[PDB]
């Protein structure tokens, strides 16, 4: 639910 590595993908 936070800022993931590699940009957002759900």
Partner 1 sequence: FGRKVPSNAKSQHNFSVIPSANIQRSVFNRSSGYKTTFDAGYLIPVFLD
Binding site for partner 1 (CB under 8 A): 2-5
Least separation in angstroms between CB 1 and partner 1? 9
Region of residue 7 (left: phi > 0; alpha: psi -120 to 50; beta: else): left
Least separation in angstroms between CB 3 and partner 1? 6
Least separation in angstroms between CB 10 and partner 1? 12
Residues in the chain: 10
């Amino acid at each position: 639910a936070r800022s993931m590595r590699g940009g957002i993908r759900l």
